């Protein structure tokens, strides 16, 4: 997964807790 809020199955992989700033903002929100 591109993390995609790793809680979603890949729980253990969760790096920056949430990862919204890193991933969902970019790959979703756009900056």
Swiss-Prot record:
PTM info: Phosphorylated on some or all of the serine and threonine residues present in the C-terminal region. Contains one covalently linked retinal chromophore. Upon light absorption, the covalently bound 11-cis-retinal is converted to all-trans-retinal. After hydrolysis of the Schiff base and release of the covalently bound all-trans-retinal, active rhodopsin is regenerated by binding of a fresh molecule of 11-cis-retinal.
Tissue distribution of the protein: Expressed in rod-shaped photoreceptor cells in the retina that mediate vision in dim light (at protein level).
Topological domain ranges for the Extracellular compartment: 5-18
Protein location: Membrane; Cell projection, Cilium, Photoreceptor outer segment
Signal peptide: none
Highest rank taxon of the organism: Eukaryota
Marked site: Plays an important role in the conformation switch to the active conformation: 21
Quaternary structure note: Homodimer. May form a complex composed of RHO, GRK1 and RCVRN in a Ca(2+)-dependent manner; RCVRN prevents the interaction between GRK1 and RHO. Interacts with GRK1. Interacts (phosphorylated form) with SAG. Interacts with GNAT1. Interacts with GNAT3. SAG and G-proteins compete for a common binding site. Interacts with PRCD; the interaction promotes PRCD stability. Forms a complex with ASAP1 and ARF4. Forms a complex with ASAP1, RAB11A, Rabin8/RAB3IP, ARF4 and RAB11FIP3; the complex regulates Golgi-to-cilia rhodopsin/RHO transport in photoreceptors.
Protein family: Belongs to the G-protein coupled receptor 1 family. Opsin subfamily.
Function: Photoreceptor required for image-forming vision at low light intensity. Required for photoreceptor cell viability after birth. Light-induced isomerization of 11-cis to all-trans retinal triggers a conformational change that activates signaling via G-proteins. Subsequent receptor phosphorylation mediates displacement of the bound G-protein alpha subunit by the arrestin SAG and terminates signaling.
Protein name: Rhodopsin
Protein source organism: Bos taurus (Bovine)
Organism lineage string: Eukaryota, Metazoa, Chordata, Craniata, Vertebrata
Gene: RHO
Positions spanned in the full protein: 93 to 123 of 348
């Amino acid at each position: 997964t591109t993390l995609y809020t790793s809680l979603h199955g890949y729980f253990v992989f969760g790096p920056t807790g949430c990862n919204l700033e890193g991933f969902f903002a970019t790959l979703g929100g756009e900056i």
